[PDB]
Structure 1
Amino acid sequence: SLTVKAYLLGKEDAAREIRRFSFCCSPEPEAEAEAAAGPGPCERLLSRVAALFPALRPGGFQAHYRDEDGDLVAFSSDEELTMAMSYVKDDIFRIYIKEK
């Protein structure tokens, strides 16, 4: 299991709302194309953040993760998630949620 921490950013980049959800270490929830048609972790995470942060649009936001440099990188692909977890050594995945 891996708890993912999300940080909501308003206009002054100030923490509006905080919420976390339990995630599986598994690559993807489903295997069939009826349930995985390419993505998996990204589409899963972006789903929870939507229901968790109703303050903004359901799918009208980008999640930005810090890199080795610290800069924000708006991720939106499973390939980018596998990389983002490579940074964190612990079982906590922090990310910066922003509404488009």
Structure 2
Amino acid sequence: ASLTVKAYLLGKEDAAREIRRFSFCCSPEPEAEAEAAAGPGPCERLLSRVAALFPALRPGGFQAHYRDEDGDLVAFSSDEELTMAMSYVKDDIFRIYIKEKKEC
């Protein structure tokens, strides 16, 4: 399941500041034997890869979102919630919206 993720980085008034467009492999998985318990999570691997590409942000300091049917930026941080996020993929493009974690 080759899945393209188009990571929007949002700015001041929720206008996009930098777009990245990488590829992601959620349903694919490594070798079918346990070298660990079971890897990282599918949302933990996503946020580890969004943090690796953008130079403008550091890992652990950003909140990834998506747009639902109402147009609202629904956040996601879990991997049982990333599966609800990915039911909104249009063609193969999973558009996420990155916002940084400021003061309050």
TM-score (norm 2): 0.76
**1:33 to partner: Cα distance:** 7.5
Structure 1 residue runs without a partner (length 5+): none
Whether the aligned pair in 1 keeps the contact of 2:88 and 2:94 (CA below 8 Å) is: no
Q: Which residue of 2 aligns with 1:48?
A: 49
- Confirm or deny: 8 A CA contact 2:26 2:42 kept in the other structure: no
**Shift in Å, 1:12:** 2.8
Looking at secondary structure, tell me which structure has more strand per residue: 1
Pairwise CA RMSD: 2.9
- Given that 2:64 and 2:75 are in contact with CA atoms closer than 8 Å, whether structure 1 keeps it comes out as yes
Query: 1:30-72, CA deviations, whole angstroms, 9 ceiling, x for partnerless residues?
Result: 7778655585211011011111112022211100111122211
The 10-residue stretch of structure 1 (80-89 or 43-52) with the greater mean CA deviation from structure 2: 80-89
Instruction: Give yes or no for contact 1:29–1:40 (8 Å, CA) kept in 2.
Output: no
CA contact (8 A) 2:5 2:95 kept: yes
What stretches of structure 2 of length at least 5 have no aligned partner? none
TM-fit CA distance, 1:73: 1.2
Distance 1:29 1:18, change over 3 A: farther
Kept after mapping to 2: 8 A contact 1:75/1:81: yes
Q: Matched residue of 2:48: which SS? A: helix
Q: Distance in 2 between matches of 1:19 and 1:42?
A: 18
SS in 2 for 1:43: helix
TM-score where L is the length of structure 1: 0.79
How far has the Cα of 1:27 moved from its partner? 5.8
Name the CA shift for 1:11/1:75 in 2 (closer, same or farther; >3 Å): same
Change (3 A) 1:45 1:54: same
Task: Name which one, 1 or 2, has greater alpha-carbon Rg.
Answer: 2
